[PDB]
Design a protein around this nucleic acid. Sequence first.
RNA 1: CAACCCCGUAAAAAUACGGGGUUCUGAAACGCCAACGAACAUCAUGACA
RNA 2: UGUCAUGAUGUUCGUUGGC
Length: 750
Amino acid sequence: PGMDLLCLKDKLEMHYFGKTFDDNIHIQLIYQILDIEKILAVHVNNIVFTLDNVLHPLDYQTLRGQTNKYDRFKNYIKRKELLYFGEAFYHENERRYEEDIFAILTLLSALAQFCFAHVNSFWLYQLEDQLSDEFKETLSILWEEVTERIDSEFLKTNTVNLHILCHVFPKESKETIVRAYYEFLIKKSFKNMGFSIKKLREIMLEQSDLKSFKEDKYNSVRAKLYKLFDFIITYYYDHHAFEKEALVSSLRSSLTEENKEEIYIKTARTLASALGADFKKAAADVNAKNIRDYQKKANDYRISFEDIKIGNTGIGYFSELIYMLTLLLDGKEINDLLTTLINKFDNIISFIDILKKLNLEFKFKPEYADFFNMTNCRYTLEELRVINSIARMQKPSADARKIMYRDALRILGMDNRPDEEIDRELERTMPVGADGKFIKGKQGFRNFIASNVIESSRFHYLVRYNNPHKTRTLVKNPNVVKFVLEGIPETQIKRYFDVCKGQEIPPTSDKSAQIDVLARIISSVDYKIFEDVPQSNFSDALKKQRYQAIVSLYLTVMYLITKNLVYVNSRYVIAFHCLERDAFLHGVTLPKMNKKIVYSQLTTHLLTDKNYTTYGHLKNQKGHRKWYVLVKNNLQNSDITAVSSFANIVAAISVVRNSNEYISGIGELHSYFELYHYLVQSMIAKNNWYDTSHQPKTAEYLNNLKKHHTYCKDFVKAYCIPFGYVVPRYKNLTINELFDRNNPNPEPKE
RNA sequence: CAACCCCGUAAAAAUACGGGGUUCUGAAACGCCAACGAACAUCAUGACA
RNA sequence: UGUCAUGAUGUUCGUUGGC
Ligand SMILES: [Mg+2]
């Protein structure tokens, strides 16, 4: 009854609750808790790799006494390429203190050690009683800065509906009206209620008096109209309170679905008849003239609203760690992490509510209850939501631009050359003149590079992840260029062919010719072409647009490859994290042989377990015997050395680093999966990380790889055998057709 | 696109095929991705006391 | 050096398409 295929229901329930339950809601909740750590580990590993790539290799009192770790710290912190991370270590164009940077690095190391599983297994869930006094101060200072910032930025953006909401409520404090509207959209008091007000207003919208807001001419404003009726309702219930409670009891005591609608039906018609006049009065204020006039005056409101804000309120310590992680990333990664966390915590809240509804045990163990309950989860969900809602410009400072210039010219030519030549070209290109000034009327290269490479997120991603010394080789191999261009859809390909046409090519609508010419023009690009940017005649505009397009395409091509390789490696990191996690639950320790780790022992152990054989993924029954036989056959073709090497490769993210030594000999590309596995197989073959004495079938795999210049499916099936205990995961991670969910190709016939 | 469990007709094998489930299986779907759009902050251009 | 026009760059919202 509700048992899982992995046969860890009892173990998981005992670990998290303490006893076994005969129902199917507890594990339903536990999977979200298990989901949080996966994404946290992925992003922490990415951050650690970034720190390693950009910077080539008791309390604070003990640090000075060591005299050796002190030397490591003094030089590691002073390295000037800390400027590549925006606010991690520099504040107001000034360096942060050594204690704060030490605190940030130590917290990152502790989080990495926690996720990749000395710190206890309960570290993240108990920060009040484990964190030292020094780190808490640094987190507090960071949150003080950001809370001053959010106080500033809030009042400026949404000061168009704020005026109307303050106006519609004469008998209310200026502070109070702002309080609830921050309680409304920045952090949702909308969501945390048993009504579906979105559906409710639709039922109100079914009432006659307010069809007068459904006119076609009102299409100019919808979002700034839909929300306004939304906020009034969540303010209408707050004042009445008892009526809100009355509707709670009536719905909870309602019988059937027909009873649900009728309760909604009569409630809505009372609502329109109650305060419909406010809806008409509010909805009559929106127009082009009023909106423009309201935007003109943006300092008529002066509200601090500091006290109950978590900036001054005792914000949780778990959210400050998330903000510290956020400091060291870009927009997409932050959005991914925050969205996943909000979804998971919302699901946890809903599930615990469901458990309480049926009068069932819902308290966790004493170790976990301090964090996992209704109130603390609600608070931490609100904190994560407010962390997500921060506007960032991330302009590349004003001092860091010099190293930016150096690396920016290093990518566009001048690969692996001494800095003296770089400085010489810097001086000869854009002169200074006398007194360290800038030659007016003769500086156009600085503007082009600064506004097209320096201030681009793609360049920051490449600098964080790719070495500027050896980045040019990613575009030298034609096949990779054609594959990446073919991945890009049709419309912007057509736009790029049009803009960067030239004068010696005839118009063609064929996409193959377009890809060919784009590959040809992107193969040979140098800094010397960019030496004639028009200073300050349609030819000048056309030339400027063509230069913008050609510099954009290059970085796009590099960035796509880097991102997709990181993404595949993160998918494999999830797999190893889950494997290490599941090894502890099942109690099967991983011993060492010849200074290695045998990652293939979990599947061997589960191959000979009666309970797993009878009620698990690997089944030995008449009619259900595919994967048992296939896994048993594939287990006999695994190299322990190769598996250990693969584990190290994915742990260190070596595919992104050493991609310049093996991307020059690939035959043909059809998916990023085969590129990734060709790179890893080439690295393993060149490093001689195999043993033919213990397994003589690796020689044929290497020979096939050499004679075909493409990855061998048998080898990827070989070094992924530790994933044998989950059949869907093995299928997804070893079969190309099932790795990507955007490919409708069926599974190949065997 | 794949796995898992029920109810059907033939069958004993590495069982096909026809209906309904699954957050209690793995794939970012409360997500990515483009082009039209509205505000906003940036950088470069002409009119002036 | 503020203002008015004039074009580029990136976010943030919503429509419309595609995964
Ligand atoms: Mg799941």
